[PDB]
Design an enzyme around this catalytic site. Structure first.
Site, PDB file in Angstrom:
ATOM      1  N   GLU A  17       6.770   4.260   4.483  1.00  0.00           N
ATOM      2  CA  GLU A  17       7.117   5.294   5.343  1.00  0.00           C
ATOM      3  C   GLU A  17       8.529   6.032   5.170  1.00  0.00           C
ATOM      4  O   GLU A  17       9.198   6.793   6.331  1.00  0.00           O
ATOM      5  CB  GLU A  17       6.810   4.968   6.667  1.00  0.00           C
ATOM      6  CG  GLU A  17       7.895   4.100   7.506  1.00  0.00           C
ATOM      7  CD  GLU A  17       7.630   2.777   7.321  1.00  0.00           C
ATOM      8  OE1 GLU A  17       6.926   2.262   6.252  1.00  0.00           O
ATOM      9  OE2 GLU A  17       8.208   1.869   8.077  1.00  0.00           O
ATOM     10  N   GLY A  47       0.863  -1.186  -0.003  1.00  0.00           N
ATOM     11  CA  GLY A  47      -0.015   0.126   0.121  1.00  0.00           C
ATOM     12  C   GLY A  47       0.765   1.173   0.029  1.00  0.00           C
ATOM     13  O   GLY A  47       0.650   2.200  -0.707  1.00  0.00           O
ATOM     14  N   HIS A 105      -1.468   6.232   8.717  1.00  0.00           N
ATOM     15  CA  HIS A 105      -0.479   4.920   9.092  1.00  0.00           C
ATOM     16  C   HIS A 105       0.888   5.379   8.541  1.00  0.00           C
ATOM     17  O   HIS A 105       1.881   5.589   9.816  1.00  0.00           O
ATOM     18  CB  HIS A 105      -0.887   3.637   8.190  1.00  0.00           C
ATOM     19  CG  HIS A 105       0.197   2.656   8.666  1.00  0.00           C
ATOM     20  ND1 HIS A 105      -0.196   1.434   9.373  1.00  0.00           N
ATOM     21  CD2 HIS A 105       1.257   2.481   8.385  1.00  0.00           C
ATOM     22  CE1 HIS A 105       0.560   0.630   9.560  1.00  0.00           C
ATOM     23  NE2 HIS A 105       1.634   1.170   8.996  1.00  0.00           N
ATOM     24  N   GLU A 106       1.394   5.732   7.364  1.00  0.00           N
ATOM     25  CA  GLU A 106       2.767   6.268   7.198  1.00  0.00           C
ATOM     26  C   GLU A 106       3.004   7.408   7.978  1.00  0.00           C
ATOM     27  O   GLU A 106       4.365   7.402   8.311  1.00  0.00           O
ATOM     28  CB  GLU A 106       3.087   6.094   5.630  1.00  0.00           C
ATOM     29  CG  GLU A 106       2.250   4.949   4.784  1.00  0.00           C
ATOM     30  CD  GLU A 106       2.723   3.710   5.235  1.00  0.00           C
ATOM     31  OE1 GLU A 106       3.860   3.413   6.192  1.00  0.00           O
ATOM     32  OE2 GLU A 106       2.235   2.559   4.919  1.00  0.00           O
ATOM     33  N   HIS A 109       4.221   6.469  11.469  1.00  0.00           N
ATOM     34  CA  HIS A 109       5.540   6.041  11.412  1.00  0.00           C
ATOM     35  C   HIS A 109       6.744   6.999  11.927  1.00  0.00           C
ATOM     36  O   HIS A 109       7.883   6.440  12.278  1.00  0.00           O
ATOM     37  CB  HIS A 109       5.834   5.251  10.075  1.00  0.00           C
ATOM     38  CG  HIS A 109       5.480   3.685  10.191  1.00  0.00           C
ATOM     39  ND1 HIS A 109       5.664   2.681  11.343  1.00  0.00           N
ATOM     40  CD2 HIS A 109       4.733   3.148   9.135  1.00  0.00           C
ATOM     41  CE1 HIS A 109       5.277   1.522  10.940  1.00  0.00           C
ATOM     42  NE2 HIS A 109       4.546   1.831   9.711  1.00  0.00           N
TER      43      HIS A 109
HETATM   44  C1  LIG Z   1      -1.027  -1.292   6.898  1.00  0.00           C
HETATM   45  C2  LIG Z   1      -1.497  -0.278   5.855  1.00  0.00           C
HETATM   46  C3  LIG Z   1      -2.216   0.898   6.300  1.00  0.00           C
HETATM   47  C4  LIG Z   1      -0.357   0.031   4.850  1.00  0.00           C
HETATM   48  C5  LIG Z   1       0.872  -1.070   4.762  1.00  0.00           C
HETATM   49  N1  LIG Z   1       1.972  -0.518   4.772  1.00  0.00           N
HETATM   50  C6  LIG Z   1       2.833  -0.658   5.781  1.00  0.00           C
HETATM   51  O1  LIG Z   1       2.550  -1.163   6.932  1.00  0.00           O
HETATM   52  C7  LIG Z   1       4.214   0.124   5.709  1.00  0.00           C
HETATM   53  O2  LIG Z   1       4.296   1.099   6.813  1.00  0.00           O
HETATM   54  C8  LIG Z   1       5.315  -0.769   5.529  1.00  0.00           C
HETATM   55  N2  LIG Z   1       6.342  -0.298   6.178  1.00  0.00           N
HETATM   56  C9  LIG Z   1       5.838  -1.278   4.112  1.00  0.00           C
HETATM   57  C10 LIG Z   1       5.918  -2.436   3.713  1.00  0.00           C
HETATM   58  C11 LIG Z   1       5.220  -3.495   3.801  1.00  0.00           C
HETATM   59  C12 LIG Z   1       5.544  -4.764   3.497  1.00  0.00           C
HETATM   60  C13 LIG Z   1       6.950  -5.002   3.456  1.00  0.00           C
HETATM   61  C14 LIG Z   1       7.995  -4.084   3.093  1.00  0.00           C
HETATM   62  C15 LIG Z   1       7.493  -2.588   3.483  1.00  0.00           C
HETATM   63  C16 LIG Z   1       0.620  -1.650   3.357  1.00  0.00           C
HETATM   64  O3  LIG Z   1      -0.209  -2.700   3.063  1.00  0.00           O
HETATM   65  O4  LIG Z   1       1.311  -1.209   2.447  1.00  0.00           O
HETATM   66 ZN   LIG Z   2       3.731   0.386   8.440  1.00  0.00          ZN
END
Ligand SMILES: CC(C)C[C@H](NC(=O)[C@@H](O)[C@H](N)Cc1ccccc1)C(=O)O
Ligand SMILES: [Zn+2]
Ligand SMILES: [Mg+2]
Ligand SMILES: [Mg+2]
Ligand SMILES: [Mg+2]
Ligand SMILES: [Mg+2]
Length: 889
Positions: free
Chosen positions: A268, A265, A301-302, A305
């Site tokens: 951050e 999605g 969310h981001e 972070h």
């Molecule tokens: C939980 C949702 C609001 C958004 C979610 N993104 C995150 O959690 C980001 O903060 C993650 N830190 C991004 C990520 C996800 C998987 C592998 C590597 C990096 C996502 O699905 O991308």
């Molecule tokens: Zn996250």
């Protein structure tokens, strides 16, 4: 395949203090020059200097400006660069390298890659090593000085972390920008973006420091108008962190950037958040309602972070839930406050109890802090995120708002400039717990089991009421089934938010009470209880558990009608449905097994149906809540309660129950569908980009839910309503019209109509694809072939692939076709995708997670496809690890 163990954590024998990068983007290649200012740490024992570096083409490497020679001084195996210890300096030194990478052909979307006409990075978790050599782990904190150069015409906008400190022209139509980011960060938070990006901008002034913050949101030119909501969401997010947590943004600028090709999605990256376009871009004309809640959640969310992930970072990847669980919790608080609807909490519970509970009872079951991993790309699970969030939320339930805020502030203040572990958070919360309980002997040592113990606890109840004594007793038991992670499960600290409802008037009989269950079982006694109450248990879903309320349907109906708590009402309804489902399922199954020429089915409880009608006809009642009550529990929730689930029998069971209820309520459904139109479809603010009304969108949800029920029921003249619905300006409506027309001869007419409406917006077209994929069509397999040939083709865009295939896997009757052709189809797609994108291939495995929960024939069919996938010579480590764990190898 190297297995990494939590217990094996050791600090590095090296230190990286400064990273100086030069990223030169050319037509057919990108050249990355890097100087690492390094040192020897106190933990060094004279070991070789080993860097992570995956798929890098070495031009040259040097130490202190002396070129190293391959074989004699270093080896490189396309994964690790090993410099032999005798060639490694004993004090501060400079390691330098020039490598060649190829973002154009990087279809795995990790490291540096091209998404349409945008160059973009994705470094979490282990992507930085695909850009340049590094000790690629989050405890390696360094300062970053980054220069990016590119063709000016193709890439006029250049972005990285920190302040832009120089911009310069380069001969041959090129240009560069230098970015310096002095604060320490882990390499997974590095990002770079280059493209012809357009933006919307705003200024935000912080609450306390009064600092001016520049907010920029970026996309390709075509979609820049769709960025306004994201900008509003960002302002809202900043305000919430200030208001609830007293936390201000610390930097001069925050950039958000939308890209079309993205594995998840959003990400951050410090001051430079990068988003899947589907989680940043929206418009009222070209987006479904869900996009609005989705953007609010993802931007929030981001942003959250920045403290919980960026400022306080992770010591190691096993601590992932400390940033992900905590940040989901923070986003949940935010969204609950922004939307002001009970459906926000309800939707999170609905997801946890279907998707996460399935995971936790599958061969993939893990605690929120796992003990081992092979692939970090498989680690970002609903358990880590969603159970993690419930574990983080329980601290708030246990402590209350005041003391929770105190404990959270303790965590931030103590860990702000450093890496952290889950114990650090529990410690901060324990200090608050000591202050709340008014004794320094109180601890939360037992609470740590939420981090280490896998599996969903089962919480069951028995009751006693003594009318003479006016004394009510709740006896509670907890039980977690043994699994592969623990033979012996231990009792958890389970907070049980409870109320007592007077069944005579529906009133609260006691004040707010949270029962602290800390043993295998306990009895909670209440005095001066004037009449036999109906207990309202686990209000707000106060612990991530299987609730076994042991209530009668009469008692559950009373809660559904009269309880104050949205979750308990929703859960009581869920429980009534579940009892019915299990009964009818067994009846259908017995008939099937015994080859019965005739048999009986237990009707749906008439007083339950009356209660649904009562709620639906209540003007005060929440429209989103109403949409839940008329919907049966998710199939993935149901499967946790049935052994050897025959999906055909379940489909028959659901069909019967819906028919039973519709036979009584269809006129009510139709009346509501019509009466809701005015407010649901109000166009007053359609051209106001920033005006978002979550109540109104819930009203549309209810309307579309009712339309679906009426269409399945072949309600007289409902096709007239469907056709008129197709003419709505709202995509949520006209896409619903497509899905509900599945039961009519006008399906392909609407298929063509809605395709025309969708084809010229990338994201809208993906929503159309999902709608077709999920259409309840007998010819769905033929339709999927049409989608492949006419629309999808050989797209490598994860959004496209996921849109075509995943919604279809929710088709209970068709995906689980007893021939196994559904399983064969998805397996082929997984294998094809795994060739270029192992992460997305593993996402596409989701349907297989329940394989051992189905009837023996379907188990065999699914297992066959998984073994076939495992036998592919070119299988990724990503997919292999996942399937080995899933098939219990
Ligand atoms: C939980 C949702 C609001 C958004 C979610 N993104 C995150 O959690 C980001 O903060 C993650 N830190 C991004 C990520 C996800 C998987 C592998 C590597 C990096 C996502 O699905 O991308
Ligand atoms: Zn996250
Ligand atoms: Mg390469
Ligand atoms: Mg404010
Ligand atoms: Mg949510
Ligand atoms: Mg595309």
């Amino acid at each position: 395949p190297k297995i990494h163990y939590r217990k094996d954590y050791k600090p590095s024998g090296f230190i990286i203090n400064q990273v100086t990068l030069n990223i030169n983007i050319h037509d057919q290649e990108t050249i990355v020059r890097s100087v690492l200012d390094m040192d020897i740490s106190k933990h060094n024992v004279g070991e070789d200097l080993v860097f992570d570096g995956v798929g890098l083409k070495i031009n040259e490497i040097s130490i202190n400006n002396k070129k190293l020679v391959e074989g004699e001084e270093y080896t490189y195996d396309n994964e690790f660069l090993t410099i032999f210890s005798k060639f490694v300096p004993k004090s501060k030194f400079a390691f330098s390298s020039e490598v060649i990478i190829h973002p154009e052909t990087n279809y795995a979307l990790t490291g540096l890659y091209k998404s349409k006409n945008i160059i973009v990075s994705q470094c979490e978790a282990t992507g930085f090593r695909r850009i340049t050599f590094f000790i690629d782990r989050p405890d390696m904190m360094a300062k970053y000085d980054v220069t990016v150069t590119a063709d000016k015409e193709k890439y006029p906008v250049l972005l990285s972390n920190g302040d832009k400190v120089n911009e310069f022209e380069i001969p041959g139509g090129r240009h560069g920008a230098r970015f310096n980011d002095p604060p320490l960060k882990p390499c997974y938070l590095f990002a770079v973006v280059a493209g012809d990006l357009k933006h919307l901008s705003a200024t935000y002034i912080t609450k306390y420091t009064k600092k001016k913050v520049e907010l920029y949101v970026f996309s390709e030119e075509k979609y820049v108008s769709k960025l306004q909501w994201a900008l509003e969401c960002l302002k809202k997010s900043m305000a919430f962190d200030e208001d609830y947590f007293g936390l201000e943004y610390d930097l001069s600028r925050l950039n958000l950037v939308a890209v079309s090709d993205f594995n998840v999605g959003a990400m951050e990256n410090k001051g430079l958040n990068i988003f899947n376009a589907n989680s940043l871009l929206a418009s009222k004309k070209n987006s479904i309602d869900f996009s609005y809640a989705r953007i609010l959640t993802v931007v929030g969310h981001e942003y959250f972070h920045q403290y919980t992930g960026n400022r306080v970072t992770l010591r190691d990847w096993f601590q992932l839930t400390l940033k992900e669980g905590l940040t989901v919790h923070r986003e949940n608080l935010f969204s609950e406050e922004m939307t002001k609807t009970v459906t926000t909490r309800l939707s999170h519970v609905d997801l946890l109890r279907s998707v996460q509970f399935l995971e936790d009872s599958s061969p993939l079951s893990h605690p929120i802090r796992p003990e081992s991993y092979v692939s970090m790309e498989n680690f970002y699970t609903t358990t880590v995120y969603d159970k993690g969030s419930e574990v983080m939320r329980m601290y708030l339930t246990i402590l209350g708002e005041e003391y929770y805020k105190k404990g959270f502030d303790i965590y931030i203040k103590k860990n702000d400039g450093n890496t952290a572990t889950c114990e650090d958070f529990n410690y901060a919360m324990e200090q608050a717990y000591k202050m709340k309980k008014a004794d320094n002997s109180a601890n939360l040592n037992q609470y740590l089991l939420w981090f280490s113990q896998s599996g969903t606890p089962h919480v069951s109840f028995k009751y006693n009421y003594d009318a003479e004594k006016k004394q009510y007793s709740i006896h509670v038991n907890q039980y977690t089934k043994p699994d592969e992670n623990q033979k012996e499960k231990k009792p958890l600290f389970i907070p049980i938010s409870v109320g007592l409802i007077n069944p005579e008037n529906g009133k609260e009989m006691i004040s707010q009470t949270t029962l602290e269950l800390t043993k295998e079982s306990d009895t909670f006694v209440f005095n001066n209880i004037a009449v036999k109450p109906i207990p309202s248990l686990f209000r707000g879903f106060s612990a991530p558990v299987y609730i076994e309320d042991q209530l009668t349907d009469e008692e559950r109906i009373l809660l559904l009608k009269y309880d104050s708590d949205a979750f308990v009402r929703y859960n009581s309804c869920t429980n009534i449905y579940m009892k019915q489902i299990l009964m009818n399922y067994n009846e259908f199954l017995k008939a099937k097994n015994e080859k019965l020429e005739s048999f009986q089915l237990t009707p749906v409880n008439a007083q339950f149906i009356d209660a649904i009608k009562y709620l639906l006809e209540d003007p005060h009642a929440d429209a989103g809540f109403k949409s839940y009550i008329v919907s049966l529990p998710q199939d993935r929730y149901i499967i946790n309660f049935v052994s050897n689930l025959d999906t055909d029998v379940l489909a028959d069971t659901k069909e019967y129950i819906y028919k039973q209820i519709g036979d009584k309520l269809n006129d009510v459904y139709y009346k509501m569908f019509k009466s809701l139109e005015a407010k649901a479809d109000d166009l007053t603010y359609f051209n106001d980009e920033s005006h978002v009304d979550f109540d109104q969108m819930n009203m549309r949800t209810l309307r579309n839910t009712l339309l679906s029920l009426l269409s399945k029921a072949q309600y007289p003249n409902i096709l007239n309503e469907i056709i008129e619905h197709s003419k709505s300006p709202y995509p949520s409506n006209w896409l619903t019209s497509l899905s509900v027309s599945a039961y009519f001869d006008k399906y392909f007419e609407l298929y063509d109509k809605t395709y025309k409406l969708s084809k010229d917006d990338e994201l809208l077209l993906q929503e159309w694809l999902k709608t077709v994929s999920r259409s309840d069509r007998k010819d769905i397999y033929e339709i999927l072939k049409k989608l492949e040939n006419e629309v999808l083709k050989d797209s490598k865009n994860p959004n496209d692939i996921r849109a075509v295939y995943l919604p279809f896997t929710n088709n209970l009757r068709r995906f689980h076709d007893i021939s196994g052709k559904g399983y064969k189809l998805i397996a082929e797609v997984i294998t094809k995708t795994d060739k270029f994108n192992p992460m997305v291939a593993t996402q596409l495995c989701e349907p297989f997670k329940l394989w051992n929960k189905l009837d023996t024939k379907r188990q065999e069919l699914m297992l066959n496809e998984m073994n076939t996938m495992l036998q592919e010579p070119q299988i990724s480590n990503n997919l292999k690890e996942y399937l080995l764990r899933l098939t219990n190898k």
